[PDB]
Amino acid sequence: YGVLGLGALLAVFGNLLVIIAILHFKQLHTPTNFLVASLACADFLVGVTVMPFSTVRSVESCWYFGESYCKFHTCFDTSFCFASLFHLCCISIDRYIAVTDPLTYPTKFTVSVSGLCIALSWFFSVTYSFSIFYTGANEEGIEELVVALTCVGGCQAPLNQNWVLLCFLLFFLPTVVMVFLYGRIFLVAKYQARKIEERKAAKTLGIAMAAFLVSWLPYIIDAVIDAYMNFITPAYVYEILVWCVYYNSAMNPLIYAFFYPWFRKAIKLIV
Ligand SMILES: [NH3+]CCc1ccccc1
């Protein structure tokens, strides 16, 4: 309790605002703002469904809720905890189309396209997960899986070497697009501040890239190499690693849709 409970409140209280204040307000019905709503829905579902159950799992060091719960609790965690990354990847593509190609931003980014990004971000991130935890492709060698995971108790979704690389590659692509489309923007926003005569572009892009890298990267990096160098990593030093991505999902509605003044201005008209 304590720290873990606070992260659950933020992931729902700080996220309910974004999903409530888009549907009700017709001033914010822009196609780019519907992607933020879908991202908010995914983060809210993380906060309501997977986080409370994983809270007790990390404080009792055992899966009290049977085995079906586990066979199920893991798969959707991997499913729509990795669906938060695709939304960031697509928001990056948004910014890139807005800035690099400014003449045709409303032409290419209609609602029809922002509706095709949500379906991809929601269905693809799920069909690959549910085909790994249930079908049994997650573990090609189960003899080592049983001793470390089942007999002691608890669930940590260990991955074998052949398939752990695939897990990594569904974080590399959501990350390679984010940095490549923010490296170019940093330069473009640099040459245009010198043209007027920079300070703000570096600060804004820094936060939008450090928040993602400081949370998702450390956990996945330690989770991809643990299928090669045996499993020397202690189980107790893994709870913080799984909670980092939960932390990231709590701050998301704060870096996006909260750091911009066009949203605070529209939401300040409550009274
Ligand atoms: N919080 C863990 C979510 C997760 C775990 C492993 C692969 C992809 C996503």
Distance CA 227, CA 161 (A): 5
Alpha carbon of 271 to ligand 1 centroid (Å): 41
Residue of minimum CA distance from atom 7 in ligand 1: 78
- The residue length of the chain stands at 271
Best of 46, 50, 54, 77 for a ligand 1 pocket test (most atoms within 8 Å of beta carbon):
77
**Domain limits of the chain?**
1-271
Non-local CB neighbours of 167 within 8 Å, separated by 6+ positions? 78, 159, 220, 223, 224
- 78 annotated ligand binder: yes
Residue of minimum CA distance from atom 1 in ligand 1: 242
Q: Identify whether the C-beta of residue 201 lies closer than 8 Å to the C-beta of residue 189.
A: yes
Q: Where are the alpha helices (DSSP H) in 81-213?
A: 83-100, 105-108, 111-127, 130-133, 143-145, 161-196, 199-213
Which pair of structure tokens corresponds to residue 128?
């690959």
- Nearest CA to 44 out of 215, 255, 209, 250 is that of 250
Distance CA 223, CA 227 (A): 8
Q: Identify whether the C-beta of residue 112 lies closer than 8 Å to the C-beta of residue 201.
A: no
Residue of minimum CA distance from atom 9 in ligand 1: 78
Q: Where are the alpha helices (DSSP H) in 2-160?
A: 3-23, 31-45, 51-60, 68-80, 83-100, 105-108, 111-127, 130-133, 143-145
Alpha carbon of 1 to ligand 1 centroid (Å): 22
Q: Report the nearest atom of ligand 1 relative to the CA of 171.
A: 8
- 107 annotated ligand binder: no
Which pair of structure tokens corresponds to residue 129?
């997960």
Q: Is 60 helix (H, G, I), strand (E, B) or coil?
A: helix
Which pair of structure tokens corresponds to residue 150?
């089942």
Task: Give the resolution in Å.
Answer: 3.2
Map tokens 């400014």 to a residue.
102
Q: Structure solved using which method?
A: cryo-EM
Distance CA 174, CA 254 (A): 19
